[PDB]
Design a protein around this ligand. Structure first.
Ligand SMILES: N[C@@H](Cc1c[nH]c2ccccc12)C(=O)O
Ligand SMILES: N[C@@H](Cc1c[nH]c2ccccc12)C(=O)O
Ligand SMILES: [Fe+2]
Ligand SMILES: [Fe+2]
Ligand code: NI
Lengths: 229, 230
């Protein structure tokens, strides 16, 4: 189990270095340009809400680990509204045809973004609570890397425009920083092998999402955020 | 297997009877009113495209998975027909990006939205002959739905002189020729019991989607289709 927690740090240290994040943290580039990837998260954020509401959560469970997951899911299932809040603030909540919105979400350029929650649902669907906690810890660690990064230009725009950002914001990183129990557990021989595969898959799928964000920024480099004071 | 194919026919006969289908077939109701449910299909039609491209399809060398892959290729095309008839019906409305997302992720379209999710979770570890059972049940549920929606659909298509592609006989026709190898297939005791489970879950999830369509019409009785003549 210490190995599993050490692999998660190893992957986070790799994950933290991706070009996307070097770009996002680059105070030499305007924060509006660094948040060009923002509308991309539309293919993920509400899927993530549903992963928490409908896939992770088991309300009827007595399992020690499942009751902790249930509390966690109740928090994480709230963040999609924060995504919609900042979409409007950043000027990305634009008038379009319904079909344009569907074609955007279901773009082949947002495949890995769109299917990250799907892959996690398939991975998790027959795991015991303890093994679900490994899935959630890895996923939560990747999320904290991304939002730590995105809160840099997010908080720069929030200060310059005198508006309260909720998603690409320190307040979002604060709740997810919380997201002392894995430490307090030891895995079967089989469980350790499954755990390593889980951590490897979640970071591989998260890196695939970040790869699409990077390509979108390049392909749509002019489509900067348009916040108003 | 003979039992499994007979359970799918029993399930179809029950599914055919749902109140939503009596409504969609009721020629005393304007077809514009009967297609109030059409935008609901936005939570399913592109998820179904992805189920076909990514979950069913395995681009293996097993004879059965090669048959599945052929099937998925046609089915992965119909989402475009959905977006064609969305525009013709006057449902391709201008709206905020967030309004589109809130619509697709509406709690009133939960079962519509998760149908494909549920089939992918059910399917992901199945051997090919059993994926074929999922596909055959799902194709049977679909044929019942499009047989019904093609009624108000072809009424509007004639009245306005426009080629409908999704709520249309041409969709029902490609589906009709879409089973030979399953009938030619021996399955074990275990496969038989798992085949039963698949057919029950595919029809109950399709029943839940159709229940949401019926509820949507009742919540949105003023939002009738607004087609224009050629
Ligand atoms: N905190 C993110 C969720 C998140 C967790 N893990 C992730 C990995 C990649 C992208 C997003 C995430 C949200 O509220 O929506
Ligand atoms: N014919 C539908 C596919 C379909 C199969 N089974 C279904 C069950 C419910 C709704 C739709 C379906 C389409 O092309 O999109
Ligand atoms: Fe979050
Ligand atoms: Fe179809
Ligand atoms: Ni499984």
């Amino acid at each position: 189990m210490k190995a599993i927690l050490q692999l998660i740090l190893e992957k986070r240290q790799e994950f933290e270095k991706l070009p996307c994040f070097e770009f996002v943290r680059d105070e030499t580039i305007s924060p509006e340009e660094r948040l060009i990837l923002y509308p991309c998260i539309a293919a993920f954020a509400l899927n993530f809400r549903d992963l928490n509401r409908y896939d992770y959560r088991d309300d009827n469970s007595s399992d020690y680990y499942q009751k902790i997951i249930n509390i966690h899911t109740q928090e994480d299932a709230k963040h999609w509204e924060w995504f919609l809040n900042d979409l409007e603030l950043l000027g990305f909540d634009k008038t379009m045809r319904f079909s344009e919105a569907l074609r955007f979400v279901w773009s082949d350029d947002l495949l890995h973004t769109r299917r990250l929650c799907h892959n996690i649902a398939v991975l998790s669907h027959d795991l015991e609570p303890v093994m679900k906690m490994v899935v959630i810890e890895a996923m939560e660690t990747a999320g904290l890397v991304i939002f730590h990064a995105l809160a840099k230009p997010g908080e720069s725009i929030a200060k310059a425009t005198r508006r309260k950002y909720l998603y690409v914001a320190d307040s979002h990183v604060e709740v997810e920083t919380g997201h002392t129990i894995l430490e307090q557990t030891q895995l079967s021989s089989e469980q350790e092998e499954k755990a390593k595969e889980i951590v490897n898959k979640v970071f591989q799928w998260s890196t695939n999402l970040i790869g699409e964000f990077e390509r979108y920024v390049k392909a749509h480099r002019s489509e900067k955020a348009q916040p108003t004071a």
